[PDB]
């Protein structure tokens, strides 16, 4: 049945609650972003109002064939009225079109649902600074202090310099990047840009990127694999077998593959610095796992919450085990005592 942490008290609203059939008493279904665990259940046969960002609304229409009459896109940073309740969508710094949702309840409670986010100090200067938040529904994906990772900027720097060096040493090397959902486009776009290539991809993936309002996208991507030296493939194909296979398909145009797997966290982060990352190599194929995250590190999450000073926190991730729940509540208490709210 729909879990309580997907329901917004004092409204008829749910968030990211599309897989439970008809939720009893729900008058509006919000969707924070176009990732499958969140949209699971939507299709062309959905007949209730869906509230989301413009970009998420492009993907509902074009990829899932949801009917236009039921898509209600809202502009960001703008006070809007939904079934008599004031709401605002804010940028979540996750994947394209991902938002956080501020709800202003008739009784005077203010609720922030983060969706999926990577907390950033820039959020401290949005509409959030302007009033108090009583309840926070928080993306707790990496809520544990072992989860450190570099800035997105440092990771992109590493990837650009790596690719550029490899291709300039060997002009017959191909670069490949894995993907399984929207998000992390900076990885492959930044590499293509330094190499003066377009990124080549399947028709299904090109269609997906064409929904995302990226400026100058027609200049950066293509479905012609032959004219491109940066190829995107499913994440599943990023391994020695899948890459040898792909290399055979290119018909002796290339003699080396350099491949990137943008993982979330991996346990080499406890020890290793970004400077010090090394590939796994077999023959003429090298594979780099890089820690490009679109979720908050532990410290970024702690700073955001200690800044917001909410009265109650409701976790949305890692809630399935008692040991996880109990550990998270312990960190919430430390943060509160240390900051004095």
Residues that bind Ni ion (CB under 5 A): 35, 116
The end-to-end CA distance of the chain, in Å, is 34
* d(C-alpha 125, C-alpha 120), whole Å: 10
Nearer to Ni ion, 33 or 261 (CB): 33
35 vs 198, beta carbon nearer Ni ion: 35
Decide whether 53 or 286 has the Cβ nearer to Ni ion.
53
Least distance (Å) between residue 293 CB and Ni ion: 11
Exposure b/e, 286-305, CB count within 10 A at least 16 = b:
bbbbbbbbbbbbbebbbbbb
Q: How far is CA 193 from CA 106, 112, 175, 217, 277, in A?
A: 49, 37, 12, 12, 22
Q: How many CB atoms lie within 10 A of CB 315?
A: 19
Q: Considering the complex, what minimum distance in angstroms separates the CB of residue 182 from Ni ion?
A: 9
Give the residue closest to Ni ion by C-beta.
116
Closest to Ni ion by CB, 120 vs 193, is 120
Question: In the bound complex, what is the minimum distance in angstroms from residue 35's beta carbon to Ni ion?
Answer: 4
What is the smallest separation between the CB atom of 332 and Ni ion, expressed in angstroms? 22
The CB-of-183 to Ni ion minimum distance in angstroms stands at: 7
Q: Quote the crossing angle between the two packed helices 322-339 and 298-308, to the nearest 10°.
A: 50
The residue (of 35 and 184) whose beta carbon lies closer to Ni ion is 35
Residue 77 tokens read as: 């940073």
Secondary-structure breakdown of the chain: helix, strand, coil percentages, each rounded to the nearest 5: 35, 20, 45
Instruction: Output phi, psi for 189, to 5 deg.
Output: -65, -40
Please state the closest distance from residue 116 (CB atom) to Ni ion, in A. 4
Q: In terms of Cα–Cα distance, which of 229, 224, 147, 132 is closest to 188? A: 229
Output 163 or 294, the one with its CB closest to Ni ion: 294
């Amino acid at each position: 049945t729909c879990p309580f942490y997907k329901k917004i008290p004092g409204t008829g609203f749910t968030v990211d609650a599309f897989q439970y059939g008809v939720v009893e008493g729900c008058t509006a279904y919000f969707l924070t972003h176009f990732h499958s665990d969140h949209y699971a259940g939507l299709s062309k046969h959905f007949t209730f109002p869906v509230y989301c960002s413009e970009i998420t609304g492009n993907l509902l229409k074009n990829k899932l064939h949801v009917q236009e009459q039921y898509i209600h896109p809202l502009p960001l940073d703008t006070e809007c009225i939904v079934n008599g309740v004031k709401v605002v969508l804010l940028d979540a710094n996750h994947c394209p079109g991902a938002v956080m949702i501020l709800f202003y309840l008739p009784n005077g409670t203010v609720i922030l649902h983060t969706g999926d986010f990577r907390a950033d100090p820039s959020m401290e200067r949005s509409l959030l600074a302007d009033q108090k938040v009583h309840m926070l529904y928080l993306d707790t994906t990496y809520c544990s202090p072992e989860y450190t990772f570099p800035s997105q900027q440092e990771v992109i720097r590493f990837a650009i310099n790596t690719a550029f060096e490899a291709v300039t040493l060997n002009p017959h090397a191909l670069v490949v990047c894995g993907t399984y959902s929207i998000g992390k486009e900076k990885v492959f776009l930044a590499i293509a840009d330094v190499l003066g290539s377009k990124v080549g991809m399947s028709q299904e993936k090109y269609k997906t990127l064409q929904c995302l309002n990226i400026p100058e996208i027609n200049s950066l991507i293509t479905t012609d694999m032959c004219s491109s030296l940066v190829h995107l493939l499913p994440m599943m194909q990023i391994n020695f077998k899948g890459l040898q296979s792909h290399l055979k398909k290119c018909g002796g145009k290339y003699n080396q593959i350099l491949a990137f797997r943008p993982t979330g966290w991996t346990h080499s982060n406890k020890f290793t610095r970004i400077a010090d990352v090394i590939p796994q190599t077999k023959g003429n194929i090298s594979i780099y796992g890089i820690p490009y995250s679109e979720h908050s590190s532990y410290l970024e999450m702690k700073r955001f919450v200690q800044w917001l000073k909410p009265q109650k926190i409701i976790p949305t991730v890692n809630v399935g085990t008692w040991k996880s729940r109990s550990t998270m509540e312990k960190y919430f208490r430390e943060w509160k005592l240390e900051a004095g709210y």
